[PDB]
Design a protein around this ligand. Structure first.
Ligand SMILES: [Zn+2]
Lengths: 104, 43, 146, 765, 183, 150, 227, 34
């Protein structure tokens, strides 16, 4: 029922995130943050048949699910500090944020 | 735990004036169960 | 009791169409709640009228209700025909949790046999969902005296 | 015997009550107190110290009840039926181990007697644990006795399962003549008994507390927690494109009146009108007394530096204020069964014991330095010589609080009476039907028949047909036949688990977007703001059924607001139900026939993932089917057995479904009075008043309920030959007529026994 | 079919992320700019960030109220507390490559009103100057008495520590190619 | 220790919630009897079942009589139990009426009864609250000290 | 109508529950005149007659601006001018304003200005929420008038409010046949012998529809012990 | 009333201006607007 509204939106999420992955191939000092599941029991973002993404970051450990999901009307900028010294440089602003979740 | 006084017993639900003066306890009484009987008359 | 369901089950389905008859008395979305009562308060009494005249003499709950000793044509009708719809203080068993009364009935379903109405007699039996709706009218029969 | 899964799902209900009986809730509570919940007491009252002579220290390393460490045998114990004929208490001594500073050298001494703990029958610390009708025949105790009750000095008493409202959670309220209130009581386990209110005076939100001299409007107490920019307030409380901006808009301009505007100036307005507790030093900064005023409030969550997670928990507390003012249909009742926390004996006898235990070692402290204030008496002085004078306040504290059932605590300063009752040996199930009952709290809503009534959210949680009448009409209730009370496990790892499944964090999400998505609520606290909940919750149960997480959880997920809930708080109800995957269940009658072979019990059913426990809140989302002939391709959680909605004392009614509903609540009040048989040892015991029948008989129309508690092994009453008719007019108003020749043959000749006692007293002279 | 291999070459650099709660991302579908930081300011052991910003002149400024009240012009600081968590690597993306580096903290930037906080300091100073109206010996820790700790002790230690005025730059190709050459 | 016998006043029940004071104790020869000589133990009036609506006792009597004649105890459970149509088949093979409603004579007058009597075994448990320890009688006795009343 | 009807009859309590008053009309037909008098008595709130209220700034003006829907006067059949609204602003003592500052600008528009620390912003906004809740026409003590039909062609007027004096004082009703509840306001309006006959008619009404039947005389002895 | 003061999002306030003008300007921020 309303679970069928969910899978079609997750299809519409992959087709919006392969676009933003491919427009940023020109390495234009562009950054993005995404979360990896810690507490491990490297890999490869890869395209399945007909619009489907998955990562396999362990030797075997598959993580099928990804999603380009949050809304932020903020300015977000990455800076690297080093040893509390003359070490302040703004690297870049952040365009998007996706997440990784393992399948169960 | 609060102490009873004079005014704390002349009033109240059956402290006085209902359980001592208006409604008392009477001698010559008794209280068993009831059970039916057709074979005797009314009164 | 199924021909009373058949008039009832179409009458709930006019929420997409949005029919509202608007009796005098400021209904505000209870016309499809107040009409169902007398619709079910007619099948509760008329089947109680069928069971009386189509019933032989020397019937024992018939011959002490033709008198005035003990009983009624309501109380024998719940024993042979139907026990009707239970009321809870002027309310026909309102919802228990999440727009429903009990987990055995689906979400926001405003039908009878889901809120209050129990169609089968004391002689036939009661089902596990409709047994509890009798155990609430049976509870306010003892609370109200206190 | 061609077995099938249509009418033989009953055969796993004996597999429930065999491994896991009917006095689960009393036996498994005290057994958790003795094993583990003593060691968590002395580890929080260790290291008794003196200030004079600062090189003295005594520390409690570990604590044990029962056996020593030298002999290490089982025990030698006064037997329970030998203990009730002498007006003695049935008890076992507390042993501790200690090391302390004697003098030249410290010394570690074991097995110090400090008291005698009473222990309930059929626990694993008493001699009746796993006996086999030969040890138990030697002890002349009944095999069919339930157990679970103290025999303190004669009389035999039972702690009743109290319940109250859910601590550490909020409830919304409405009133017409008073405005609305927002109670939120919180009880952290150290001295803290605090409830906060979010009240509305004539259209303005406030926040009052019984340690603040006045009320404070909430726009102060959110700039006090860092949320200051005054667009972030409305962005958290209201949302967007709504009427909630219009109701809330009054509280914004009271920042302009008080002229604060910043998080530094925000604090000191609170502690300017705080009721100052007498500190005896008063180092009051006028900067830290307000920073702790956002620590002693709403004791769910504590902070380190940021004050952030406490802020938007106040913002969610005041959003449901505004929604309640928008329509009063959104309010909640405090009589719904999801808002009740049942609490057992052994997790309530532990509130008493640590009151007694700290009162032990602060009388034992001041008895030391009364000797150590001597010049000569500081070298050879030993401390364990004077330990036994203080030991008698543990035993006499415990035995006085069980007999006279009122518990005088200090930490919460609260005087619950009526917490123990003497069990009634009128009949067999009169003493078993008491062991499963509920004693409510009577929160003084005596006008309202709401909580006096019965809720529809009660089907199979606890029994529906047993409730008294008269003075107590709806506040005394009874557990059903299938029921387990949960236990709290831990909230640290599951908070680490939900990050892995793909939730974001509270410190990263923008406040414009937390109302667009849902939100995970952990014990009522938002932490993660998940998106697409239905992939998140369905991947959570597959960790639960296959067994990565413990099974006493609930994933209630409503839709009136945008929130999904988790609850692991323990002390709440549940029952088990078999998972239905799709239009075909997981019944799998090859598993069910292998149960009768005897290797695949009920506990291995939930180990695989065929059955799990649902509470009342996880029945919001589920769609339980009655019978296997009713499966829909949208239908979960087939109901395991439908007559389990009636307890062991309403269960003996034959054909209850045909009968009227007030004629089942009239029999439970009288089944506890029908004379009969009591136990097998009934000619050995000396009780106050014990009714017996000469020749009882088992009934003709039995029930499955009476053979699951072994009622017919010792029945009560006998079956006459009724000829229903009117006769001689002496049977008019439900009186009845029996014959003289049947009474002389022995129809209903009872027998009445009555103790009386004296004591030969020894005087002063 | 296609696959994009990622590897994790980032250490030695505890890089932070901020969150401007004031300026939006896009303005009428058009992406906005970040304002230019005059100087930065960092407090170790308390992880604060007093980022200074300039606000524009007379046209939208109203200096006649700003000068006469607090005498502090053209500086708007905004405080951010460094909050740490696991996960959440930072990824710059090469042609058919994507290279990760761990993010150490994420601080949230709220507008810290500095000048009107300090406008009451001289007002508090002038209180006892119009009303002037008028010994440090050791004691002993007693085991029946307690001392402040936890939340309010961390505010006593976070107001008095070393200031650091950061040399704010905008380089980052040195950070880029150093990561590229490492596998 | 004392034992006693149930004279009138002693309160019986039915396991379905129908209280009753024992009203009279008549002799055996005045009680009715069926064709075989079975004298009933207890007679209860018909005038409860319309108001009390207890169809359980009307079923418990059928599921009980058929169990005696077949030698096997029967189950009355909740939401189930032994059905009715399979229980009149036993009750017609043994020779009795299909609804348990037998016919019997009278012990006062001798001839048959112009109606039919519903006859069978019902479990009557005996309650507490007997009249041997409720009869009270105070003529002129002790008086309290502060009020000088009984 | 049960026990909580007998309770406040014999208590003669001040705050009664549901104090409906019963009034019979003059004519028999609707004729668009049976609910023209329910317009004359219902507390007509101005948020039903207004449509758009906003604050208009030129450079130096602080005035809220109100417009009415003149067609709603045609719709629900009430009768009033435009200037009596401007009367009804200054007849509201809760908004502590000056007496005569009001000026009409046009036919369907009306605006009121304010002038004086920081009085400017605060009391143009406190009054923005306190203007759209004033009574402009109707009796200031009733709650909600409702017209109904009886078992004949004649129709009466049911009004669920306390006041009875001004209800008799209005037009289109006859002050000869107007009963009520709340006995001890008849004792104020209609003397003492009308209070004695009202207690009679209240007790034997709430015992007619419960089935029991005492007598007329057992209430006529109860009426005279009070008055 | 959508009275956001940008760079702080705080509030606006109709202040008594020069020659009695009805300017709007907030405290705790050097900002003004007609
Ligand atoms: Zn500003």
């Amino acid at each position: 029922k309303e679970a069928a509204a969910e899978l079609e939106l997750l299809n519409a999420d992959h087709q919006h995130i392969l676009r933003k992955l491919k427009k940023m191939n020109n390495k234009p000092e562009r950054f993005m943050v995404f979360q990896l599941p810690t507490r491990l029991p490297v890999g490869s973002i890869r395209v399945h048949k007909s619009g489907k993404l998955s990562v396999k970051i362990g030797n075997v450990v598959m993580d099928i699910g990804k999603g380009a999901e949050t809304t932020f009307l903020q300015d977000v900028i990455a800076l690297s500090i080093a040893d509390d010294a003359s070490s302040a440089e703004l690297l870049g602003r952040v365009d998007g944020k996706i997440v990784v979740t393992p399948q169960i | 735990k609060p102490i009873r006084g004079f005014c704390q017993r002349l009033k109240g639900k059956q402290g006085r004036f209902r359980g001592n003066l208006s409604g008392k306890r009477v001698d010559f009484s008794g209280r068993t169960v009831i059970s039916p009987d057709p074979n005797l008359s009314i009164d | 009791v199924e021909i009373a369901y058949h008039k009832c089950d179409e009458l709930i389905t006019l929420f997409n169409k949005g029919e509202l008859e608007t009796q005098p008395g400021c209904n505000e979305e209870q016309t499809l709640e107040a009409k169902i009562g007398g619709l079910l308060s007619k099948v509760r009494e008329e089947v109680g009228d069928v069971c009386i005249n189509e019933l032989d003499n020397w019937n024992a709950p018939l011959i002490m209700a033709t008198c005035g000793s003990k009983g009624s044509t309501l109380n024998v009708s719940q024993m042979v025909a139907v026990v009707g719809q239970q009321i809870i203080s002027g309310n026909r068993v309102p919802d228990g949790f999440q727009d429903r009364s009990l987990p055995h009935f689906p979400k926001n379903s405003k039908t009878p046999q889901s809120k209050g109405f129990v169609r089968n007699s004391f002689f036939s039996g009661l089902s596990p969902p409709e047994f509890l709706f009798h155990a609430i009218s049976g509870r306010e029969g003892l609370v109200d005296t206190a | 015997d061609e077995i099938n899964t249509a009418q033989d799902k009953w055969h796993l209900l004996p597999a429930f009550l065999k491994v896991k009986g009917l006095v689960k809730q009393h036996l498994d509570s005290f057994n958790y107190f003795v094993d583990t919940d003593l060691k968590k007491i002395i580890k929080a009252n260790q290291l008794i110290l003196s200030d004079v002579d600062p090189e003295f220290y005594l520390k409690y390393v570990d604590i044990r009840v029962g056996k020593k460490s030298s002999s290490s045998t089982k025990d030698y114990l006064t037997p329970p039926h030998e203990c009730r004929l002498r007006d003695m208490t049935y008890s076992a001594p507390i042993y501790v181990d200690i090391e302390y500073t004697r003098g030249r050298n410290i010394i570690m001494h074991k097995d110090v007697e400090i008291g005698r703990m009473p222990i309930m029958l059929r626990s694993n610390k008493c001699i009746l644990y796993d006996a086999d009708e030969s040890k138990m025949a030697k002890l002349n105790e009944c095999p069919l006795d339930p157990g679970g009750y103290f025999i303190v000095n004669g009389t035999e008493k039972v702690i009743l399962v109290q319940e109250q409202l859910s601590k550490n959670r909020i409830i919304v309220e409405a009133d017409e003549k008073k405005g609305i209130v927002q109670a939120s009581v919180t009880s952290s386990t150290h001295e803290r008994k605090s409830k906060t209110y979010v009240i509305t005076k004539n259209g303005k939100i406030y926040l009052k507390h019984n340690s603040i001299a006045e009320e404070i409007p909430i726009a102060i107490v959110l700039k006090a927690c860092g949320i200051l920019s005054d667009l972030e307030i409305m962005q958290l409380v209201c949302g967007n494109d709504s009427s909630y901006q219009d109701i809330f808009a009054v509280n914004l301009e009271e920042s302009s009146k008080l002229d604060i505007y910043t998080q530094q100036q925000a604090l000191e307005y609170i502690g300017a009108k705080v009721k100052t507790m007498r500190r005896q030093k008063l180092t009051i900064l006028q900067e830290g007394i307000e920073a702790i005023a956002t620590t002693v409030i709403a004791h769910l969550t504590v902070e380190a530096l940021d004050f952030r997670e406490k802020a938007l928990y106040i913002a969610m507390m005041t959003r449901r204020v505004v929604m309640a003012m928008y329509n009063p249909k959104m309010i909640d009742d405090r009589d719904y069964v999801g808002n009740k926390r049942l609490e057992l004996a052994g997790q309530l006898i532990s509130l008493l014991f640590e009151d007694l235990f700290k009162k032990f070692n602060n009388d034992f402290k001041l008895s030391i330095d009364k000797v150590l204030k001597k010049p000569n008496r500081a070298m050879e002085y030993d401390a364990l010589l004077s330990i036994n004078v203080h030991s008698n306040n543990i035993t006499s504290g415990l035995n006085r609080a069980i007999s006279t059932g009122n518990w005088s605590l200090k930490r919460f300063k609260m005087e619950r009476a009526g917490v123990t009752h003497v069990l009634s040996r009128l009949s067999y199930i009169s003493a078993l039907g008491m062991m499963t009952r509920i004693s409510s709290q009577f929160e003084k809503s005596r006008k309202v028949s709401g909580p006096r009534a019965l809720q529809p959210s009660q089907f199979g949680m606890l029994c529906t047909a047993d409730t008294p009448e008269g003075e107590a009409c709806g506040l005394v209730k009874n557990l059903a036949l299938m029921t387990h009370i949960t236990t709290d496990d831990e909230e640290e790892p599951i908070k680490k688990l939900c990050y892995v499944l793909g939730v974001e964090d509270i410190t990263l999400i923008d406040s414009a977007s937390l109302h667009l998505n849902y939100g995970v609520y952990l014990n009522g606290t938002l932490i993660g703001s998940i998106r697409f909940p239905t992939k998140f919750v369905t991947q959570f149960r597959h960790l639960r059924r296959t067994g990565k997480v413990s099974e006493f959880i609930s994933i209630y997920s409503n839709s009136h607001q945008m929130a999904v809930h988790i609850a692991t708080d323990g002390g709440r109800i549940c029952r088990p139900l078999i998972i239905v995957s799709d239009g075909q269940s997981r019944v799998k009658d090859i598993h069910l026939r292998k149960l009768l072979d005897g290797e695949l019990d009920f506990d291995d059913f939930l180990k695989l993932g065929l059955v799990e426990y649902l509470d009342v809140n996880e029945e919001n989302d589920s769609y339980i089917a009655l019978y296997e002939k009713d499966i829909v391709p949208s239908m979960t959680h087939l109901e395991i057995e439908p007559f389990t909605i009636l307890g062991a004392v309403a269960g003996l009614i034959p054909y209850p479904h045909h009968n009227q509903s007030p004629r089942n609540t009239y029999q439970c009040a009288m089944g506890k009075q029908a004379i009969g048989a009591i136990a097998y040892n009934q000619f050995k015991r000396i009780d106050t008043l014990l009714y017996l029948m000469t020749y009882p008989q088992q009934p003709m129309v039995k029930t499955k309920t009476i053979e699951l508690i072994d009622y017919d092994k010792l029945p009560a009453g006998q079956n006459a030959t009724v000829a229903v008719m009117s006769y001689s007019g002496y049977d008019i108003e439900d009186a009845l007529v029996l014959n003289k020749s049947s009474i002389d043959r022995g129809f209903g000749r009872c027998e009445t026994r009555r103790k009386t006692t004296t004591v030969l007293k020894r005087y002063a002279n | 079919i296609e696959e994009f291999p990622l590897k994790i070459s980032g250490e030695e650099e505890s890089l932070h992320v901020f969150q401007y709660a004031n300026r939006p991302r896009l303005v009428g579908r058009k992406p906005a700019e970040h304002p230019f930081i005059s100087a930065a300011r960092y407090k170790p052991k308390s992880h604060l960030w007093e980022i200074d910003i300039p606000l524009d002149e007379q046209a939208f400024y109203n200096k006649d109220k700003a000068e006469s009240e607090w005498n502090g012009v053209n500086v708007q600081t905004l405080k951010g507390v460094g909050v740490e968590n696991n996960g959440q690597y930072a990824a710059f993306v090469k042609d058919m490559q994507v290279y990760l580096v761990p993010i150490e903290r994420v601080a949230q930037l709220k507008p810290f009103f500095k000048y009107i906080d300090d406008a009451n300091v001289t007002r508090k100073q002038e209180d006892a100057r119009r009303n002037p109206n008028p010994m440090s010996v050791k004691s002993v820790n007693d085991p029946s008495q307690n001392r402040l700790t936890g939340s309010l002790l961390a505010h006593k230690v976070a107001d008095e520590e070393a200031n650091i005025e950061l040399t704010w730059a905008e380089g980052t190709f040195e950070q880029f190619k150093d990561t590229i050459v490492k596998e | 220790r004392q034992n006693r016998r149930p004279e009138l006043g002693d309160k019986f029940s039915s396991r379905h919630g129908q209280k009753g004071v024992c009203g009279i104790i008549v002799k055996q020869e005045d009680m009715p009897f069926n064709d075989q000589g079975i004298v009933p133990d207890i007679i209860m009036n018909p005038h409860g079942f319309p108001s009390r609506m207890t169809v359980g006792k009307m079923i418990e009597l059928i599921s009980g009589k058929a169990g005696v004649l077949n030698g096997t105890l029967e189950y009355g459970t909740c939401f189930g139990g032994s059905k009715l149509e399979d229980m009149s088949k036993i009750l017609v093979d043994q020779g009795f009426n299909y609804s348990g409603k037998d016919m019997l004579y009278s012990g006062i007058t001798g001839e048959c009864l112009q109606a039919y009597i519903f006859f069978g075994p019902i479990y009557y448990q005996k309650l507490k609250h007997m009249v041997l320890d409720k009869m009270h009688a105070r003529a002129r006795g002790p008086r309290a000290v502060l009020t000088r009343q009984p | 109508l049960g026990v909580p009807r007998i309770k406040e009859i014999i208590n003669a309590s001040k705050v009664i529950s549901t104090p409906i008053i019963n009034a019979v009309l003059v004519n028999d037909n609707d004729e668009r005149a049976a609910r023209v008098v329910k317009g004359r008595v219902e507390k007509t709130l101005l948020s039903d007659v207004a449509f758009y209220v906003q604050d208009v700034y030129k450079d130096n003006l602080s005035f809220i601006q109100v417009r009415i829907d003149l067609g709603t006067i045609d719709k629900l059949q009430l009768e009033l001018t435009i200037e009596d609204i401007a009367v009804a602003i200054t007849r509201a003592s809760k908004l502590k304003i000056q007496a005569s500052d009001v000026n009409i600008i046009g036919k369907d528009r009306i605006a009121i200005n304010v002038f004086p620390e920081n009085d400017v912003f605060y009391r143009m906004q406190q009054l923005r929420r306190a203007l759209p809740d004033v009574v402009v026409k109707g009796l200031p003590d009733i709650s909600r008038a409702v017209i109904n039909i009886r078992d004949d062609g004649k129709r009466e007027l049911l009004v669920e409010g306390y006041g009875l004096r001004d209800v008799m004082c209005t037009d289109g009703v006859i002050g000869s046949r107007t009963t009520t509840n709340h006995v001890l306001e008849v004792f104020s309006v209609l003397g003492i012998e009308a209070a004695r006959y009202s207690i009679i008619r209240e007790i034997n009404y709430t015992m007619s529809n419960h089935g029991m039947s005492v007598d007329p005389r057992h209430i006529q002895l109860l009426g005279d012990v009070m008055t | 009333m959508l009275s956001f003061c940008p760079s702080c999002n705080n509030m606006l306030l109709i202040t008594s201006g020069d020659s009695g003008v009805y300017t709007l300007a907030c405290r705790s921020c050097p900002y003004e607007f007609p």
